[PDB]
Subunit: 343 residues, 4 copies
């Protein structure tokens, strides 16, 4: 269900992308002039934004900042500095700083610092074991091919390189054991590979799970707060739901729900309003749920539900939905009649 | 066990596969004439089916449709259009549309939109981070080999390409740092690799997990309606069972359970009938469980239980089976006497 | 710890491995005569074993069999047949059958069948999605390089091959887009790669998790069944322990616990006996636990605990151990005083 | 946050790394003289420490050792032996032993032995299955290319090598099916690959998870013990917290909490002291928590909290924090007043 609410999503990211677009030599006149010019203007928009932030201390209702400001500070100062110090050639390198911006929207890095942090004593141990494993292999591979390939196994670092290629799963094809036994040794190498392949894996596995778990405070602590519905529940029931709860702003003109289109979930409205294409034009206010008969029934969208405007929405899975109907019979009853209003 | 169980599974899939067989130049023979003709006939079968769906509004007693119809509409209209608009040599491209059909029987894509959707703000950030990482690497690799390989590192996009090959774990072997330091840098590239290799991973891991979760809850609900047995239980106990419950439809002639053959689980019958090769011919009706003494005992299939006909079966794990025997001692008692009937 | 513990593990496996050692042409004298001869003798030993099983209805202590016998039947008949039917030089191919044997001691394949089976309706869909994804890529890649490489992209299957190389993470290096855009297209391909990389993964993730889950049936009877200790507990407490419980059979002469050697767990004895190197020689009978002061204290092995003989041991985690001590104060008291006996 | 926190971490690791730096041929005098000499001195420092451990029976107040000592013994004796036995040019190989040390601070290897150990019966079966799969492929690949590439597929081991390259996801590029059908067979090979790719995976997945689970006794059993806070809770609540609890030792001069800097957690002090940059200079004693208003509020670090000295800190997640405040309202109340002192 994507039309325009991620309106903000729709227009800032591109500035970050254009950095790559410019990056090319042996380039013609028609595209280079426009693109190079655009970054200076984007830069200026951000520069204007900075004056507001450094200078201004009001955001609306609630907000907090510090290292985050530092990130923004670095982002604007660097491209500027490139412009100033460098009256010369490549300084577009300095522009790259844009990519710093997207990290702000995620639940990852300052937290990653925290999580990477609490297990630095062990995770580091795994990688060190890794450097070590690379070392023993270099010794093994080198002895078999030193005389035959002074050219390729001439040295430990040459052997070390092959370990690098072989260890990860890349295998370039330029260097290989010409002799029969070396191939046999690689057989052992293949076995150490299972473990190795797994290491690449340990790092992201903990990080993604962590990062997702973290969004629970932003997305699933604050978000839970607007829906008054969430309050009947205490700490144990809420966390399972918290892992489950999902966000997304739908806007002006978006077809939230297509009429006729399957709805295997229901939507809750936090902010903004939505419109229902039905018998009695229903505009939905905060504390509203729609497509609920979708679940009672197990069928579609009741109406074309189109976001009246920019609206933040929460959706509920069938497993979770039974919990809400059971927790509050009154709520099951309301979903059905409101659904009657919705359908 | 498989014989003619998903009778339906056995037949439709082949039409989807034939698209690949046809797709060959420098072709001759008996093979090309038959195959090209078959797609038009398959198209016609589906075309006939479409008239039925567009025209017909009765399905028995269990269905709902909309975007799904749209998929079917696209599927038939496209190969049709190629036939009409194109009197031209290549229109078999348009036929490919068949592969759209398999998505229909999965728990994934409409659902995928919901998963990918609720975490689009975090998930895309990781990939954007990926473009970023790729960029810095292009810079580092390019500086090392620009003079040496105007031919290979002639430009950022050339460097960028190497980052693509190297980042994933593919490594073609046509480009590499000739110089020693470059090889050393690749050592750093290798450590960034763990993170990288992991990204490829974050995407399917979440999708498969959800996809299975989506199908399972519905399957459990269906089993509960179908198996009266499921009703004693409330929302908390059923979900664990729901992840566990599993289904297929055995048919005519399938030997559901080989006699003598180990049975480490038992089967429940939702629809259809089954036949038991035992002292008293036993045909099993709905609400029937068999091979239960298999579990009480911990041994095989009681009988050659062959599907009397097309039958939908559910199987229960030993861990789960204890829960059913303990929840209802009456049920445990029944499993043993019926088992006496079954064995 | 290992000495001759799985006395059985030590000897049968080698016969399975020897199949590979023989497999070499341009072979000479001393190795070939012995190795070829050995398989016939191993075959004969198995043939004798078969006569016993086909003709024998007695057991060491409780068993069940049917499809398993069929596996054994196929295993001996094939190398036999090769011997008889083939006076021909290559029939060692038929010998390979040995590898069928190891599947017998695992918790996987009959189970894999049932599990793969209950989700063939969806796992197959993912792979099908894979064949189709492969198809769109072949079309895309072919278009860019048809004129340039009639030799490499001369045909869809030629393009299809590259999709195979690229899709998995192998990348041979013999084929690549010569032109700039193809490399750009490969950029999209790289992104579709993450999804693909994940598919390879979806299959094992379900199988390994489950295969381990399955051994619970063997494990519960094995540790829970012979340790009277396990009976205080009911179905909910046991399963968590069940995932946790672990086993091996130590033998004659094995030093179960090195004396002075850290013991981060304790061992339970199901079958066989063990000896303790301490003030009072202690031989441990069934229903015995040792190295428990290792946990109360959090320090090593009390004594060199050496398996008096072939013994089946279960070990308990510190997390689990607290549950045992808390569930039964009397048990906590016994562990310390017995420990006094052990230390 | 990191400054001189693990003071110890900062110094020992480098000695381990230096082994790689020295290991280079075609080297020059300026770098080589210093580096070669450093290992002898590092060796001597370790030699000194060993005499202390060998001849000493005290330290701090709570330790145990045996196999661990054996590791240390092997570590010093080896480089010594190389020095003594070998007046010879290459003995730096013997020095490598340093890397043995890192395993000491991890929760993995003795324990890995423990887990690998209770699952030798099942992991081994999969790996052997792997050799088996490799065998069938060597047979199939060899038949297609024996005449064409006596040079590449001349033998099963030559075919076997390709199986190694192909099986893992490396693909060098030197040996490929020239013929069309092999390319088709490779299509089957690609499918068996998913299964293959997964094997590499089963090994690290269980190992990392268990390894992390293991630090629960060191880090989350005895270590938690210093927070009196942990006592109210019983065995079930603690384990969830135990997986969650995390540690580092900040030192002299580290700014624990940047002031202004987001604090999305709070820190507990086990050992050492910390200083708070606020209205009342606050030095924090053991049993202290800071940045708690960070959670009540959901905003940063109250103060620049800088480690007064070497301090061991525990940090608490928001999900966990709610449990703490709810378990003891008295504690919630204390967090806010202390927070008043901290802020
Ligand atoms: K590769
Ligand atoms: K390659």
């Amino acid at each position: 269900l994507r039309i325009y609410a991620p309106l903000n999503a729709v227009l800032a990211a591109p500035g970050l992308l254009a950095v790559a677009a410019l990056t090319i030599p042996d380039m013609s006149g028609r595209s280079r002039l426009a693109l190079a010019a655009l970054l200076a203007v984007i830069w200026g928009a951000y520069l204007l934004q900075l004056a507001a932030t450094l200078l201004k201390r009001r955001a609306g209702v609630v907000r907090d900042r510090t290292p985050k400001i530092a990130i923004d500070v670095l982002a604007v100062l660097v491209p500027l500095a490139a412009f100033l110090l460098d009256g010369s050639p490549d300084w577009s390198l300095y522009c790259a700083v844009w990519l710093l911006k997207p990290l702000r929207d995620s639940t990852f890095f300052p937290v990653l610092g925290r999580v990477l942090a609490n297990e630095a004593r062990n995770l580091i141990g795994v990688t060190t074991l890794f450097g070590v494993v690379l070392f023993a292999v270099a010794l093994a591979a080198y002895v078999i091919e030193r005389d035959i390939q002074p050219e390729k196994f001439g040295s430990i670092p040459q052997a070390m390189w092959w370990a690098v290629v072989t260890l990860s799963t890349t295998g370039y094809g330029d260097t290989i054991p010409q002799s029969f036994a070396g191939r046999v040794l690689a057989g052992a190498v293949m076995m150490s590979g299972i473990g190795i392949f797994g290491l690449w894996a340990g790092i992201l596995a903990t990080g993604f799970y962590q990062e997702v778990r973290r969004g629970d405070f932003v997305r699933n602590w604050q978000l839970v707060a607007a829906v008054p519905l969430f309050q009947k529940l205490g700490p144990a029931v809420l966390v399972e739901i918290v892992r489950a709860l999902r966000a997304r702003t739908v806007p002006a003109g978006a077809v939230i729900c297509r009429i006729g289109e399957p709805g295997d979930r229901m939507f809750f409205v936090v902010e903004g309003s939505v419109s229902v294409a039905t018998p009695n034009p229903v505009e939905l206010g905060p504390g509203a749920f729609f497509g609920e008969m979708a679940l009672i029934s197990g069928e579609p969208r009741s109406a074309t539900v189109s976001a009246a405007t920019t609206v933040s929405l929460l959706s509920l899975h069938s497993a979770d939905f039974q919990m809400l109907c059971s927790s509050s019979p009154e709520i099951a009853e309301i979903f059905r009649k409101t659904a009657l209003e919705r359908r």
